[PDB]
Amino acid sequence: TSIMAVTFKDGVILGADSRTTTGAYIANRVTDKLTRVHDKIWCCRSGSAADTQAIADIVQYHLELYTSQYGTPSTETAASVFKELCYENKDNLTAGIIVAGYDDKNKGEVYTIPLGGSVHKLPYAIAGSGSTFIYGYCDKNFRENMSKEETVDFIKHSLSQAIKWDGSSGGVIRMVVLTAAGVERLIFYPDEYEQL
Amino acid sequence: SDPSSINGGIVVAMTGKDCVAIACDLRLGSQSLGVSNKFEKIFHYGHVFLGITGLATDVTTLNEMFRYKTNLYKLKEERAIEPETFTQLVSSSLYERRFGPYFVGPVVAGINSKSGKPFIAGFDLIGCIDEAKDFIVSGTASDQLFGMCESLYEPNLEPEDLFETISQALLNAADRDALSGWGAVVYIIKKDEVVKRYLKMRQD
């Protein structure tokens, strides 16, 4: 996997590749790693496909029950539920999750949750095996309060490089845009991003 | 220390024209040491026949268990259990011990009393059903039995002919296996009569 989430002026954008592997075999070349846990709280999944699915399903259940009782949960609240599961079951899980959401008060927020189950709030986050190859690129090119089009290009160029160098990453580049306007899904195919 | 090959033994079952046959060797050993030449591996509950290979303690235990369950079945149902139903019972019972299984290779054989159709089936140690038109094999000489049955078998054999085919399949398979032999028994099963024959074989 190569995944990332980036905050910008109008909100936040999640990005991911579409590759799922069993050793060197690609079990799924059109995987959707960007998954909804609430209307405007999404997550990027990396690590075990089984573990990350089971976790995301439980979080979605918790946030649905939260909403019925206490109204719309914060992005911080969603990250806390993820953390609780990842931390308390650290011995039996292999899950690297990035939580991203849009509030009206707090605007775009990004929380990353590595293997151990720690939580880290950041302006942007990268994760997955392919992220290693773009730490330098992302650090040099990230700016706060970017526009939607700038942020889309940043994610596109970043994941393009991650895919190029990482054998465990590839396929299409999926993106999910979270703003006050609503939820927008984007997709970018090899013929476009490879020749960037 | 491989539970399925400590005691040794084999079972084979075949279908014919309006009949079925099931046969087994009589050996029970402790690895190289032969201990008993009277250890029969075929049991019956009413008109349904069950052969069991593998670890002898589990063979004995399962027979006692299926006797238990078929006796209660008959008391409540007020009728004898049929082969197709018994096959499912065996499968359920084995899978119940999925993560601590009985080390066995059971084989069901019998004729349905209502339809008159010949029926055989085989299982793995955790209860997977292997249904077959022709034949089923089990035991430490299963490879040998597969080879004999696949070449010797033909469909719609008469009881007297079927007897010779299953007997020859068992005998020659058992002689190419160290842990099988020391005697043999063959059940010929017709709709309303059952003949049991002990075979003469080499005792080494």
Partner: protein
């Protein structure tokens, strides 16, 4: 690969020379590879060797032994002693000790100066002179029949039967022993072959005539 196979071999000294008796079965695990294996190696017309452990190791080096014995008598103009022949083999396998040879054999011969002589030779270097030896997976079964019925003043006929009956006892009980029985009688003038005997037919024949094996239905 699998060199560790089962067997029952014996050889004993008596008034009329030496009896050698072996089974014929070869196994690769539970699979019976052969029922017609020659486990007595005819080193030369006067010397015999038994096969137990590695089949190849026994065949190769006891044939090699026959070559050394032929060279000895060409140079010394005299028959080689059983002591000297056995020691050539034991010294050889001792050089290979640790490498992984697998061997348990009885070197049998009858000469003027020695008389009937048997040496147990083994792949870890052991060389023992003795009157009775039994080797293989079924050696214990054969020893029981031998010990209880053995006497020095046995006749040639009775001694041949004893060796045949002892192998049968092992063939019956030991799963890795059986097939057929090969008999040999070693005299001062050379060894004499006393035929191949199928255990299947031999068992039923002995059961009826002897009254033994009542535990078995026949």
């Amino acid at each position: 690969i699998k060199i560790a196979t089962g067997a029952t071999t014996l050889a004993f000294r008596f008034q009329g020379g030496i009896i050698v008796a072996v089974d014929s079965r070869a196994t690769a695990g539970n699979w019976v590879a052969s029922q017609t294996v020659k486990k007595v190696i005819e080193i030369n017309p006067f010397l015999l060797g038994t096969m137990a452990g590695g089949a190849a190791d026994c065949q190769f080096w006891e044939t090699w032994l026959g070559s050394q014995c032929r060279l000895h008598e060409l140079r010394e103009k005299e028959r080689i002693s059983v002591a000297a022949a056995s020691k050539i083999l034991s010294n050889l396998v001792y050089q290979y000790k640790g490498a992984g040879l697998s061997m348990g054999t009885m070197i049998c011969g009858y000469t003027r100066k020695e008389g009937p002589t048997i040496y147990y030779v083994d792949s870890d270097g052991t060389r023992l002179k003795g009157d009775i030896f039994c080797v293989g997976s079924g050696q214990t079964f054969a020893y029981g029949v031998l010990d209880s019925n053995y006497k020095w003043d046995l006749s040639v006929e009775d001694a041949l039967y004893l060796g045949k009956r002892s192998i049968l006892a092992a063939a019956h009980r030991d799963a890795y022993s059986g097939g057929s029985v090969n008999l040999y009688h070693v005299t001062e003038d050379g060894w004499i072959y006393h035929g191949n005997h199928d255990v299947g037919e031999l068992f039923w024949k002995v059961k009826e005539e002897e009254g033994s094996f009542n535990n078995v239905i026949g």
